[PDB]
Amino acid sequence: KRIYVSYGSPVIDGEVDDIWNNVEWNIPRIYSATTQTNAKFKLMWDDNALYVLAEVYDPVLNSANSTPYQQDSVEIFLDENFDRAISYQSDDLHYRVNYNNFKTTDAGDILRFYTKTKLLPDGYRVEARIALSKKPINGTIMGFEFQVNEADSSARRVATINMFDNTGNAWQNPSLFGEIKLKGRSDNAVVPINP
Ligand SMILES: OC[C@H]1O[C@@H](O[C@H]2[C@H](O)[C@@H](O)[C@H](O)O[C@@H]2CO)[C@H](O)[C@@H](O)[C@@H]1O
Numbered sequence: 001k002r003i004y005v006s007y008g009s010p011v012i013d014g015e016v017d018d019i020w021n022n023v024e025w026n027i028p029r030i031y032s033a034t035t036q037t038n039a040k041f042k043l044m045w046d047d048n049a050l051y052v053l054a055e056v057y058d059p060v061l062n063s064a065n066s067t068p069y070q071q072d073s074v075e076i077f078l079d080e081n082f083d084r085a086i087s088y089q090s091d092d093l094h095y096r097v098n099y100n101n102f103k104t105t106d107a108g109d110i111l112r113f114y115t116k117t118k119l120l121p122d123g124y125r126v127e128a129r130i131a132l133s134k135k136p137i138n139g140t141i142m143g144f145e146f147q148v149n150e151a152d153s154s155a156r157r158v159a160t161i162n163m164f165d166n167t168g169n170a171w172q173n174p175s176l177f178g179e180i181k182l183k184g185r186s187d188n189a190v191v192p193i194n195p
């Protein structure tokens with residue numbers, strides 16, 4: 001299915017901008033296995049970028065495994081041109097950041113990826129910017145996926161949570177991503193914001 005993304009320009013600092021409160025939480029509900037770990041994320045776009053704000057409830061944080069996706073982490077997938085190819089094109093993106101803000105790319109220039117995290121009681125927050133290369137406009141559709149890796153005290157991934165793909169294959173297959181449609185940018189810009 002499809003998430004409608006509002007226009008707006010958050011500050012990347014791991015803090016919840018006022019403007020995030022005007023936008024709805026998306027709840028990923030596709031669990032590989034049962035787990036106490038849950039998550040929610042909000043999206044926003046501006047002329048230059050896509051923005052993700054993710055909160056994970058996860059009582060045990062682990063990143064001791066040297067395999068990135070075997071650490072408690074979130075992953076963001078983007079099919080920017082909306083090709084929906086069955087294998088990764090050169091505009092496809094697959095990014096990951098752990099609760100300590102350690103970033104990895106599986107596909108795409110990591111110079112486009114800017115993140116902050118914050119430890120919360122019972123979990124963590126990720127706040128992420130992805131620089132877009134196609135100038136987005138109202139009505140732009142992109143393919144998107146969101147994933148949480150849940151690791152336990154044995155230093156190994158024990159579960160995944162996905163928004164859209166239930167088949168383990170988003171890392172290989174962009175056609176599996178869901179859809180985001182960008183809306184809400186004014187046609188006139190601003191004028192004089194009066195004092
Ligand atoms: O199914 C094993 C497969 O995993 C690839 O790792 C994936 C991971 O399974 C997935 O959940 C996450 O989205 O992305 C990584 C992409 O690295 C692994 O790299 C393959 O060698 C392996 O066959």
Ligand SMILES: [Ca+2]
Nearest residue numbers: 011013015017
């Ligand atoms: Ca912020």
Ligand SMILES: [Ca+2]
Nearest residue numbers: 079080081083
């Ligand atoms: Ca693509």
Ligand SMILES: [Ca+2]
Nearest residue numbers: 060061072151
């Ligand atoms: Ca965990």
